[PDB]
């Protein structure tokens, strides 16, 4: 089997991407944030504290003939941006772009943090990291991909995120029309439960490539590119007026600037992030100070190849017995 679904930026900055998911019988379609940095599929629901719902579409298990309460199971998650959610668990039928899983754990939110309430466009998350990170207790549950894997034509999914435009998540096949040149594959460590890999270095604009190992995660659920302070300093030093602002919480730059590209290495191959992808617009409405798309990972504890990086590539998440990651230009 295979699946193919379009993923759509939530706003004009590509702050996140939503993908429609069918849950239950008859189908209830929710728009979920596909997140290769976590492993819980959770949804706003009929059980969510009413004051914490503000415009989201909810899953109502009582209206689904295939929903079953997973007795005794609870979940609770905290994300790197300080947001959180928790609740109980159902199993139900979940379909993505024509690919169907029966008995998928659907984690129903009783509580969500303010960040989630305030984002009316995101109805929940669909985790695509390794199932070892799943928070369901006392019986850990599998991700959608993990459940689908054996049925897929090939044990892979691909992320093809757009810049200011829709893109695609495919399950079970590689669309050879969706990228240019070749896919370069690179090793993955699953030891922390993430799609963790090592970039071979970087370049800033038309500058020379610096060969250096940068361990990080391929994370579709994080907006920006978070790299070591040395790398990030080297980038922003090429933008007149750019500075790190403690009050804003990162590097800012004059909105009048033309940003240089940033290149990262995948083995001997190179992915180029155009300068425009690194512009996240005014820090506040009407400001001429703009927020940068490349930020320091110092004090995150891990480097994160988020959407800014991933949207410059066609990315293969290979879930073979020994997982790997593939990157192609597009």
What's the CATH code of the domain at 238?
2.40.70.10
Q: Are residues 168 and 304 in the same domain?
A: no
For the chain, what is the domain count?
A: 2
Q: Pairing state of beta strands 156-160 and 314-318?
A: antiparallel
- Half-sphere exposure (Cβ direction) of 291: Cα atoms closer than 13 Å: 20
| Number of other CB atoms surrounding residue 248 within 10 Å | 15
Task: State yes or no: is 199 an active-site residue.
Answer: yes
Q: Are residues 101 and 12 in the same domain?
A: yes
Q: List all residues 6 or more positions away from 202 whose beta carbon is below 8 Å from its beta carbon.
A: 209, 210, 212, 214, 227, 231, 262, 263, 264, 265
Set 199, 261, 296, 297: catalytic member:
199
Q: Are residues 135 and 204 in the same domain?
A: no
- Domain enclosing residue 227, as ranges: 175-330
**Distance of alpha carbon 192 from alpha carbon 109, whole angstroms:** 25
| Residues 190 and 275: beta-carbon distance below 8 Å | no
Set 14, 33, 35, 146: catalytic member:
35
Strand partners, 19: 32
Q: Are residues 318 and 180 in the same domain?
A: yes
Strand partners, 84: 78
* Beta-sheet strand order (sheet of 289-292): 243-245, 250-254, 289-292, 279-282
Q: Are residues 214 and 325 in the same domain?
A: yes
Q: Are residues 165 and 41 in the same domain?
A: yes
Residue at which a domain ends, from 118, 153, 174:
174
Q: Are residues 89 and 185 in the same domain?
A: no
DSSP letter at 155 equals S
Q: In a 10 Å sphere around its CB, with 0-12 CB exposed, 13-18 middle and 19+ buried, how is residue 240 labelled? A: exposed
Residue at which a domain ends, from 143, 174, 205:
174
Q: Are residues 65 and 206 in the same domain?
A: no
Task: State yes or no: is 114 an active-site residue.
Answer: no
Q: In a 10 Å sphere around its CB, with 0-12 CB exposed, 13-18 middle and 19+ buried, how is residue 170 labelled? A: buried
Q: Are residues 193 and 311 in the same domain?
A: yes
Q: How was this structure determined?
A: X-ray
Structure tokens at 170: 């495919």
DSSP three-state, residue 178: coil
Q: Are residues 164 and 207 in the same domain?
A: no
Residue at which a domain ends, from 148, 174, 200:
174
| Residues 9 and 162: beta-carbon distance below 8 Å | yes
Please report the resolution in angstroms.
1.5
**Distance of alpha carbon 271 from alpha carbon 260, whole angstroms:** 14
Strand partners, 17: 9
Q: Are residues 42 and 57 in the same domain?
A: yes
Output the CA–CA distances (angstroms, integers) from residue 86 to 25, 130, 260, in the order listed. Answer: 24, 19, 41
**Distance of alpha carbon 263 from alpha carbon 134, whole angstroms:** 33
Q: List all residues 6 or more positions away from 56 whose beta carbon is below 8 Å from its beta carbon.
A: 44, 120, 122, 123
Q: Are residues 99 and 219 in the same domain?
A: no
């Amino acid at each position: 089997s295979t699946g193919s679904a379009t993923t759509t930026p939530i706003d004009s900055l590509d702050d996140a991407y939503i993908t429609p998911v069918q849950i239950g019988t008859p189908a209830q379609t929710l728009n979920l944030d596909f997140d290769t940095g976590s492993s819980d599929l959770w949804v706003f629901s009929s059980e969510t504290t009413a004051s914490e719902v503000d415009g989201q579409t909810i899953y109502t298990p009582s209206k689904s003939t295939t929903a079953k309460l997973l007795s005794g199971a609870t979940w609770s998650i905290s994300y790197g941006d300080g947001s959180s959610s928790s609740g109980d668990v159902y199993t139900d039928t979940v379909s993505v772009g024509g690919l169907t899983v029966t008995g998928q754990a659907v984690e129903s939110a009783k509580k969500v943090s303010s960040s989630f309430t305030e984002d009316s466009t995101i109805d929940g998350l669909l985790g695509l990291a390794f199932s070892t990170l799943n928070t369901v207790s006392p019986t850990q549950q599998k991700t959608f991909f993990d459940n689908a894997k054996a049925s897929l034509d090939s044990p892979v999914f691909t992320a093809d995120l757009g810049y200011h435009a829709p893109g695609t998540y495919n399950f079970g096949f590689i669309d050879t029309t969706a990228y240019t040149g070749s896919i370069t594959y690179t090793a993955v460590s699953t030891k922390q439960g993430f799609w963790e890999w090592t970039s071979t270095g970087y370049a800033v604009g038309s500058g020379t490539f610096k060969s250096t190992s940068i361990d990080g995660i391929a994370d579709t659920g994080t907006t920006l590119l978070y790299l070591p302070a040395t790398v990030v300093s080297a980038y922003w030093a090429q933008v007149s007026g750019a500075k790190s602002s403690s009050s804003v919480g990162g590097y800012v730059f004059p909105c009048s600037a033309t940003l240089p590209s940033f290149t990262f290495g995948v083995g001997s191959a190179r992915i180029v992030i155009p300068g425009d992808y690194i512009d996240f617009g005014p820090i506040s409405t009407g400001s001429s100070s703009c927020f940068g798309g490349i930020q320091s990972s110092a004090g995150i504890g891990i480097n994160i190849f988020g959407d800014v990086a991933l949207k410059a590539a066609f990315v293969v998440f290979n879930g073979a017995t020994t997982p790997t990651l593939g990157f192609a230009s597009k």
